[PDB]
Design a binder for this molecule. Structure first.
Ligand code: HEA
Ligand code: HEA
Ligand SMILES: CCCCCCCCCCCCCCCCCC(=O)OC[C@H](COP(=O)([O-])OCC[N+](C)(C)C)OC(=O)CCCCCCCCCCCCCCCCC
Ligand SMILES: CCCCCCCCCCCCCCCCCC(=O)OC[C@H](COP(=O)(O)OCCN)OC(=O)CCCCCCCCCCCCCCCCC
Ligand SMILES: CCCCCCCCCCCCCCCCCC(=O)OC[C@H](COP(=O)(O)OCCN)OC(=O)CCCCCCCCCCCCCCCCC
Ligand SMILES: CCCCCCCCCCCCCCCCCC(=O)OC[C@H](COP(=O)(O)OCCN)OC(=O)CCCCCCCCCCCCCCCCC
Ligand SMILES: CCCCCCCCCCCCCCCCCC(=O)OC[C@H](COP(=O)(O)OCCN)OC(=O)CCCCCCCCCCCCCCCCC
Ligand SMILES: CCCCCCCCCCCCCCCCCC(=O)OC[C@H](COP(=O)(O)OCCN)OC(=O)CCCCCCCCCCCCCCCCC
Ligand SMILES: CCCCCCCCCCCCCCCCCC(=O)OC[C@H](COP(=O)(O)OCCN)OC(=O)CCCCCCCCCCCCCCCCC
Ligand SMILES: CCCCCCCCCCCCCCCCCC(=O)OC[C@H](COP(=O)(O)OCCN)OC(=O)CCCCCCCCCCCCCCCCC
Ligand SMILES: CCCCCCCCCCCCCCCCCC(=O)OC[C@H](COP(=O)(O)OCCN)OC(=O)CCCCCCCCCCCCCCCCC
Ligand SMILES: N[C@@H](CCCC[NH3+])C(=O)O
Ligand SMILES: [Cu+2]
Ligand SMILES: [Mg+2]
Lengths: 47, 59, 239, 76, 49, 524, 64, 74, 265
């Protein structure tokens, strides 16, 4: 654990960090622009 | 130090004695209801029926 | 009187109320354009004359005196100047010294209006009551507007006083015709009074300004101001 | 330093917004309609000629926007 | 840098802009006044025929 | 398992701040998607993409308003920046009452789920942002959507009350040594004042919507016309909440802007006591006026006069604050980085919004301008420009700190310029239409107003481009292979800093303090 | 002056027991093992499933 | 030939609640009908006033309530 | 130890009770809607969520008691902070009941034309404001005096009579809630009546709910004082209970005066 670490995150360490953060932000955007559209799609799928 | 405890003990005992007397007074009253009022428009409204619809809760 | 494409500012006035509104907005805008241009100028000159290449020394002043009280006081007199006319407009618009000559209830139903010029009937049941429906898309002639033309418009004599009692029957609404400068809310329980006095003939258009259920903005209002003789003929013919 | 990049990106942003607008409201890549009042292309014509003389229910035709359009009848 | 000069020139520009806007407003008010004046005491009517 | 403990369980005010930031970004994207859908529907006269179902349009406007006014600015100003930078800045260890912090943040996402499910049930909540009683009555909706939305408001309100109690007790108790109240920075001060407003006003909204709920379902007559109980009662209660609600979305913005100007002008904030007292007075006079939102409903003349006077008096202190900020840039050694860009844009556009607000504050002018897009322009400049631009400024200024990396500068300036141009194009024609007279909240407009709404619709897509650029910036920051330096940024390299939070580390270690700071406190 | 109905050394024994374990706060004691890993866990699982089913039914307008 | 006149501007109600104005006029007309009855002139005056003021739906509902014996107020 | 931590504030350790309580709140809210509108899973979901909230609250207070009584993490400063937080909570509740009182007053100063322009509405048989409500006020007044007696029991070093005073107060609070229940059952008008009945019942019901929660707070403090968890110098739980009960009594006093005295006049 990293309670006793010099940096709370120490983000550099993880495995190349690039694909992980890219997917993270893209999935954040997908959840932000998928549900609002999906609500309208479902409402038209209804009556 | 303890005089305050004694004094509030005394007045709380007085309070509960008076309250018990007043409870004896209030009870033993028959409480006969008067006649139902005429059905004014603003009484007994049902905008959306209750889940336990026909009569309100506590009846 | 009617909305215009690519228009800046208010529509035309047909009520002393609307004249007051135009004048008050113009006074307010005069004071506030002065304020805005002065603030923008001071901000720009502060940013530009001290742009890291002329003054690289912070110059370290933090306590100010006899200028803080100045920008505390001068906006106060600015507000006094821009609140002198507003109060006068309010307390010269409230008073109705003259008796209203007619009375036009405007009951705001759910997605369509209704009106009753009830002060002409000898009985108790009301005569001269009708409904103000929006004209659908395909029921228009080549000229009229869209979703803003009404069957059987409101008729009103011009150059004579009025008193319209706004109220509703289903949900919140608002009687709102801008050219007359009239906007008020029809709340299902109350009977709001609006005293207005048109000054010229012609037709004036307006819309609902409150969220009614689904056909909101399809619940329009049309008021005609016509000569008194013609208004008399129309009422006698409608009875 | 970067004013080239900033201005180029602003113009590119305007271009992209224009393309999206053109596809979504001029050709409607997402289904929709257009009013019969705008596609006729002669409706505004009659709307203006009617601001000249707007029809009325009780009384002769009467004008609208008298001030802001400077259109009104004379001695009669 | 002169603070008083900057504030003075800002107030002066504000007043100039306000004067331009007020001239606009005065011309509009005169147009409305003359239109209604004529509408009562002049050739101008409002019904076409 | 250790990572799920550290995230779902940990108290750690910094980590709760990070979670708040992620939630704020998600909610912001959702709100912008709703806004783009609204603009797409309003692009041309007629039925554009909704193809009818104006009920769905009303649902869309309601959901957009709730999403961005409750789940985007508040979780980012209070939860986002507050949680992080109150205890770090004030010179204290972990916040007081950490469990309240965690429970508030984890209350928020269920509130989000309630709001979306309210937008998704049988028909929807087409009642606007301000749920008015008779439309939200059981005769006119009969769905349950309004019930779900009301419970969403309950959960959000309870979470914000818990957070407000947290912040008030932390500022009053958890300060460092020697640090008198008049040495805590203005960010701490603004968070204190906004927390007091959030503690006092929000329960009234909870009472009003509880009363609406028991009017709908349990069949009372609080807002049913037959039996007394006019809807004016609900208007009064909701807006007694509503105006303190809107002087909460901007006060943390004021604090952040003060800090940014102070750190970019090489000099601290001019007239510190003036700033503090002006902000306290804004907080106090945010309560004494609440009906300046309902001038056109039928109040008597004297109430209208009084509320006019109250709005002018609340206008004065914001003027003091803006002039103070202008003063504290007269020093010199400015440097135009992106946080300074966004602070300057904040000041300018908030000035424009405030002047429009003054125009709206009068009575007769509100009679002419009630519920027309003039009001929409007013509060979109004020709220969007002010709060969101302060948010972006704070985000850059302190992503210098949270992650430890730093954004690329040309992209930061590109994003500022794109967003400024787009969102200032798309909201000024709202002023013009409001003057023309189009009513607010309509899916179709007469043919006359079609001129500008094609132009405003051209403004939303630029802002979408800006937000996509912003997320590219966030990703390139989180994967930037070049840490914090002196050439990149000159802030954190200061061996002497006005604010305590810059001289600690790149991210704070875990307790932010191996040992608390001190104060010399001379005159022995 | 009277101690309240307990010897107060049972509390001291309990203090020794609590300060003499090497876990987090919510897992100390044998009572808390059962409690704070079985009751809230299964209870939240059931709550989550019922919440999902309820949202589904309300949205689709089924099972009135 | 038409009348072209209506209810006057009452000193008691300078606000915007002709709801109170409606109720007051209705009560005065029925106080006529009760006490005087043959004060046909003044009570036709009161009748014309509340007809001009009160909306038709309110008048009809109140008349039916008065007949039913469930009319709140005097 | 403090000498290594270098500051006396409190640093808590992770606990899933925040997230668990939030999940319980979501359960309660969806169950509430699904019972408000007729649905299959309504009643069971609402009850399950409500007991979930109760359980998480129980384990949460248990954890706080465990820390502060056995671990001893409470120092003087966090002791003060708890008082700060609870005073703020009481202020929030004051504003909530203020909103309810505003609803009543705005509905009862100028009664509408549709309830006769008079108050109370004709045909609502107002309770005599002196038979039961006066007894309820006397009961709560004696309960407040007993709470003060308990406080002066704890303070004066006499840690045995504190349980006697607390149990007397709990008995009085139970008597009060029993008489309020009797009043509800013998009510000559229900909630679905006019604005008078509606506001009366909403305000009185929330006041009674606050009475229930204050009473259970007092029961918890009584059990703690019997077990010895409280001392003359270090006791915040009892001080919170006393302040909350004084709050409830003051709200009842305002309620009695306004509603029962004025509304019946
Ligand atoms: C938070 C406040 C907020 C914000 C930001 C916005 C943003 C926008 N709003 Fe919204 N709007 C409201 C609050 C807000 N709105 C309210 C309260 C109403 C009233 C509803 C009603 O009256 O009932 C309304 C109504 C409203 C309407 C009228 C609806 C109607 O009349 O039918 C319209 C019309 O187009 C509109 C448009 C827009 C547009 C184009 C934007 C654009 O600016 C989109 C926003 C752009 C951004 C730049 C912000 C996004 C930022 C991010 C996602 C990054 C976040 C960063 C992190 C947190 C790290 N809004
Ligand atoms: C976001 C926060 C916020 C802020 C800061 C403001 C600012 C102000 N608002 Fe705003 N307002 C809203 C939120 C906000 N508003 C919202 C959400 C709505 C829509 C509600 C709805 O949907 O109904 C609204 C709408 C609204 C209305 C109309 C409501 C209706 O009729 O539709 C009114 C009118 O009373 C009003 C008043 C004011 C006033 C007087 C100010 C003033 O405080 C502005 C102060 C700012 C300054 C004036 C600029 C700085 C001052 C100077 C540089 C000094 C010089 C100025 C003077 C000479 C004093 N607001
Ligand atoms: C405490 C913090 C975490 C709480 C998590 C609780 C989750 C509870 C389960 C939610 C659920 O089942 O939603 C179903 C509902 C189901 O919605 P639905 O009913 O529209 O499902 C669609 C079903 N078909 C495919 C047949 C049409 O899910 C949602 O509403 C999605 C919300 C996503 C939110 C993302 C953020
Ligand atoms: C401040 C916040 C934003 C407020 C926006 C308000 C816009 C507005 O009011 O526009 C309408 C205004 C008048 O419209 P107009 O067509 O002339 O007539 C309508 C009826 N009078 O039309 C206009 O405002 C159009 C511009 C008119 C000229 C105004 C000039 C003001 C600035 C003067 C700067 C002088 C030099 C400074 C250096
Ligand atoms: C009336 C409507 C508004 C009108 C606004 C007009 C603005 C005009 C601006 C003209 C600028 C001309 C600059 C010509 C080159 C000067 C030399 C140079 O290097 O300029 C760049 C300088 C920014 O450099 P700086 O931020 O100091 O550097 C830090 C980065 N190492 O650039 C600057 O300092 C430019 C600063 C511009 C400040 C504008 C502030 C808002 C005004 C409103
Ligand atoms: C950038 C992100 C863009 C995402 C686009 C997703 C499009 C999904 C889709 O296909 O939505 C279906 C529907 C489109 O309409 P549809 O019924 O296909 O009509 C065509 C008949 N002429 O969709 C609708 O009717 C409503 C949604 C329209 C598209 C909204 C895009 C919003 C982007 C915000 C960023
Ligand atoms: C308003 C309603 C919400 C509850 C408010 C409770 C205020 C309590 C005041 C306070 O300071 O409580 C402290 C205590 C947590 O203390 P802690 O932060 O752990 O301190 C460590 C120091 N030893 O605080 C707690 O333990 C608070 C626990 C609250 C649990 C609430 C669960 C339900 C949440 C509301 C759902 C509403 C749904 C409506 C439908
Ligand atoms: C936190 C982690 C939560 C993990 C579990 C989330 C999904 C919960 C779930 O499984 O809900 C059940 C629901 C289907 O409903 P069900 O009861 O299976 O259908 C009865 C038909 N006879 O499942 C669904 O309707 C699935 C809907 C798809 C989206 C799932 C996630 C939504 C919430 C995100 C927050
Ligand atoms: C505070 C709310 C507490 C709720 C506790 C759980 C209640 C589940 C439903 C229980 C139920 O149906 O109880 C029946 C009872 C009426 O019983 P009844 O048949 O009238 O009595 C026979 C006498 N002849 O009716 C009731 O008990 C009515 C309970 C209504 C609760 C509504 C809750 C709505 C959501 C509140 C969120 C907080
Ligand atoms: C915070 C959210 C709170 C949501 C509350 C929803 C409404 C709950 C009460 C619904 C009305 C009801 O059932 O009233 C019944 C009763 C009134 O009596 P009545 O039915 O008129 O009986 C006739 C003669 N006795 O009794 C009442 O009216 C009691 C009113 C008070 C109810 C208290 C509910 C507390 C819920 C706490 C949730 C915490 C999380
Ligand atoms: C509506 C919700 C109202 C919730 C009120 C919560 C108040 C919390 C007060 C608090 O945190 O008190 C701290 C106290 C810690 O005990 P302490 O006094 O420090 O003991 C010293 C021993 N040497 O904590 C305690 O002693 C624990 C007190 C528990 C009270 C539980 C009340 C439950 C009410 C349930 C309503 C449903
Ligand atoms: N399942 C329903 C049955 C009654 C409603 C349909 N008839 C209950 O709950
Ligand atoms: Cu306001
Ligand atoms: Mg309105």
């Amino acid at each position: 654990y990293y309670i006793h670490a010099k940096h709370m995150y120490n983000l550099d360490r993880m495995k190349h960090r690039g694909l992980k953060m890219s997917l993270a932000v893209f999935s954040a955007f997908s959840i932000g622009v998928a549900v609002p559209v999906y609500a309208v799609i479902f409402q038209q799928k209804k009556t | 130090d303890a005089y305050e405890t004694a004094k509030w003990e005394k007045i709380t005992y007085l309070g509960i004695v008076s309250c018990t007397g007043l409870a004896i007074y209030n009870l033993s009253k028959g409480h006969p209801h008067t006649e139902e009022p005429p059905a004014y428009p603003y009484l007994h409204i049902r905008n959306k029926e209750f889940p336990w619809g026909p009569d309100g809760l506590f009846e | 009187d009617a909305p215009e494409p690519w228009q800046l500012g208010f529509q035309d006035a047909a009520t002393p109320i609307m004249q007051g509104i135009m004048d008050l907005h113009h006074d307010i805008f005069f004071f506030l354009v002065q304020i805005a241009v002065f603030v923008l100028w001071v901000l720009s000159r502060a940013l530009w004359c001290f742009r890291s290449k002329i003054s690289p020394i912070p110059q370290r002043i933090v306590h100010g005196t006899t200028i803080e009280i100045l920008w505390t006081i001068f906006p106060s007199i600015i507000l006094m100047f821009i609140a002198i006319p507003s109060f006068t407009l309010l307390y010269s618009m409230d008073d109705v010294v003259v008796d209203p000559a007619i009375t036009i209830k405007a009951i705001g139903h759910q997605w369509y209006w209704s009106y009753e010029y009830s002060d002409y009937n000898n009985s108790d049941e009301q005569s001269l009551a009708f409904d103000s429906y929006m004209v659908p898309e395909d029921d228009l002639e080549l000229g009229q507007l869209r979703l803003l033309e009404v069957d059987n418009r409101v008729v009103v004599p011009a150059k004579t006083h009025l008193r319209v009692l706004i109220t509703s029957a289903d949900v919140l609404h608002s009687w709102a015709v801008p050219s007359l400068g009239v906007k008020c809310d029809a709340v299902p329980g109350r009977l709001n009074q609006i005293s207005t006095f048109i000054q010229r003939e012609g037709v004036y258009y307006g819309q609902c300004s409150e969220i009614c259920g689904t056909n909101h903005a399809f619940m329009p209002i049309v008021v005609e101001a016509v000569s008194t003789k013609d208004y008399g003929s129309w009422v006698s013919n409608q009875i | 330093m970067s004013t080239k990049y900033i201005v180029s990106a602003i113009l590119g942003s305007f271009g992209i917004a224009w393309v999206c607008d053109y596809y979504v409201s001029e050709k409607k890549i997402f289904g929709g309609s257009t009013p019969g009042t705008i596609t006729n292309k002669e409706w505004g014509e009659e709307t203006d000629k009617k601001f000249q003389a707007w029809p009325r229910t009780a009384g002769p035709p009467v004008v609208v926007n008298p001030i802001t359009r400077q259109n009104f009848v004379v001695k009669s | 840098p002169s603070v008083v000069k900057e504030i003075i020139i800002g107030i002066t520009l504000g007043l100039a802009a306000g004067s331009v806007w007020k001239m606009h407003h005065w011309n509009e008010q005169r147009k409305i006044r003359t239109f209604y004046d004529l509408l009562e005491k002049g050739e101008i009517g409002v019904v076409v025929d | 398992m250790t990572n799920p403990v550290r995230w779902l369980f940990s108290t750690n005010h910094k980590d709760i701040g990070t979670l708040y930031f992620i939630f704020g970004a998600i909610a912001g994207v959702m709100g912008t998607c709703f806004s783009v859908l609204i603009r797409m529907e309003l692009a041309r006269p007629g039925d554009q993409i909704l193809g009818g179902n104006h009920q769905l349009y009303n649902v869309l406007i309601t959901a957009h308003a709730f999403l961005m006014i409750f789940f985007m600015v508040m979780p980012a100003m209070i939860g986002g920046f507050g949680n992080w930078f109150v205890p770090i800045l004030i010179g204290a260890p972990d916040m007081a009452f950490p469990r309240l912090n965690n429970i508030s943040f984890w209350l928020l996402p269920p509130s989000l789920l309630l709001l979306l499910s309210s937008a998704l049930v049988e028909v929807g909540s087409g009642t606007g942002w301000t749920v008015y009683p008779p439309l939200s009555g059981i005769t006119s909706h009969s769905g349950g959507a309004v019930d779900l939305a009301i419970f969403s408001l309950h959960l959000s309100g309870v979470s914000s009350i818990l957070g407000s109690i947290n912040f008030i007790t932390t500022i009053f108790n958890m300060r460092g040594p020697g640090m008198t109240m008049h040495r805590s920075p203005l960010f701490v001060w603004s968070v204190l004042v906004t927390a007091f407003l959030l503690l006092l006003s929000l329960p009234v909204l909870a009472g009003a919507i509880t009363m609406l709920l028991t009017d709908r379902n349990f069949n009372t007559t609080f807002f049913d016309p037959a039996g007394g109980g006019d809807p004016i009662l609900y208007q009064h209660l909701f807006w007694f909440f509503g105006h303190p609600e809107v002087y909460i979305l901007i006060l943390p913005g004021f604090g952040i802007i003060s800090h940014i100007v102070s750190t970019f002008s090489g000099k601290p904030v001019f007239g510190y006591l003036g700033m503090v007292y002006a902000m306290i007075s804004i907080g106090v006079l945010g309560f004494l006026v609440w009906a300046h939102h309902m001038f056109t409903v039928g109040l008597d003349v004297d109430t209208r006069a009084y509320f006019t006077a109250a709005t002018m008096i609340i206008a004065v202190p914001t003027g003091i604050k803006i002039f103070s900020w202008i003063a504290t840039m007269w020093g010199g050694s400015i440097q135009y980085k992106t946080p300074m860009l966004f602070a300057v844009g904040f000041i300018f556009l908030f000035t424009i919004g405030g002047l429009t607000g003054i125009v709206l504050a009068n009575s007769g002018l509100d009679i002419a301008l009630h519920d027309t897009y003039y009001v929409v322009a007013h509060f979109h400049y004020v709220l969007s420009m002010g709060a969101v631009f302060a948010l972006f400024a704070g985000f850059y200024y302190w992503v210098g700190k949270i992650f430890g990396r730093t954004y690329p500068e040309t992209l930061g300036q590109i994003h500022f310029w794109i967003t400024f141009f787009g969102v200032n194009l798309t909201f000024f024609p709202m002023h013009f239409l409001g003057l023309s007279g189009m009513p607010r909240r309509i899916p179709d407009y007469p043919d006359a107003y079609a001129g500008w709404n094609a132009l405003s619709s051209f403004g939303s897509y630029i802002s979408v481009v800006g937000i996509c650029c912003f997320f590219v910036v966030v990703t390139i920051t989180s994967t930037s292979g070049n840490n914090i330096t002196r050439a990149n940024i000159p802030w954190a390299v200061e061996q002497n800093s006005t604010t305590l939070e810059w001289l600690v580390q790149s991210p704070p270690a875990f307790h932010t303090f191996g040992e608390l700071p001190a104060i010399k406190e001379t005159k022995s | 002056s009277e101690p309240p109905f307990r010897p107060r050394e049972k509390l001291i024994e309990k203090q020794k027991h609590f300060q003499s374990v090497h876990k987090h706060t919510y897992l100390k004691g044998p009572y808390d093992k059962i409690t704070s890993v079985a009751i809230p866990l299964a209870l939240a699982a059931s709550s989550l499933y019922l919440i999902g089913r309820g949202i589904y039914n309300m949205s689709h307008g089924i099972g009135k | 030939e038409i009348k072209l006149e209506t209810a006057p501007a009452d000193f008691r109600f300078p606000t915007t609640n002709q709801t109170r104005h409606c109720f007051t006029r209705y009560i005065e007309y029925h106080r006529c009908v009760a006490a005087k009855g043959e004060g046909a002139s003044e009570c036709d005056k009161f009748a014309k006033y509340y007809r001009s003021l009160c909306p038709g739906e309110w008048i009809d509902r109140w008349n039916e309530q008065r007949e039913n014996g469930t009319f709140p107020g005097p | 130890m403090i000498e290594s931590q270098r500051h006396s504030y409190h640093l808590v350790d992770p606990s899933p009770w925040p997230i668990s309580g939030s999940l319980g709140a979501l359960a309660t809210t969806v169950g509430g809607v699904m019972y408000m509108h007729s649905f299959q899973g309504g009643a069971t979901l609402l009850s399950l969520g409500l007991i979930f909230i109760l359980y998480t609250m129980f384990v949460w207070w248990r954890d706080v008691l465990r820390e502060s009584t056995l671990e001893g993490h409470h120092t003087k400063v966090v002791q003060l902070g708890l008082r700060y937080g609870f005073i703020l909570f009481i202020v929030s509740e004051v504003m909530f009941l203020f909103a309810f009182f505003w609803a009543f007053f705005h509905s009862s100063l100028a009664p509408t034309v549709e309830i006769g322009g008079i108050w109370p509405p004709l045909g609502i048989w107002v309770l005599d404001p002196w038979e039961i409500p006066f007894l309820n006020t006397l009961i709560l007044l004696s309960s407040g005096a007993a709470v003060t007696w308990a406080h002066h029991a704890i303070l004066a070093g006499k840690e045995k009579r504190a349980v006697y005073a607390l149990v007397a107060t709990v008995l009085l609070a139970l008597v009060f809630t029993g008489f309020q229940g009797m009043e509800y059952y013998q009510a000559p008008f229900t909630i679905s009546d006019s604005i008078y009945g509606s506001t009366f019942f909403l305000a009185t019901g929330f006041h009674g709910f606050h009475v229930i929660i204050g009473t259970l707070f007092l029961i918890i403090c009584g059990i703690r004082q019997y077990l010895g968890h409280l001392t003359k110098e270090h006791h915040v739980g009892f001080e919170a209970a006393a302040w909350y009960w004084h709050f409830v009594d003051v709200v009842w006093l305002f309620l009695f005066v306004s509603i029962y005295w004025w509304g019946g006049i």
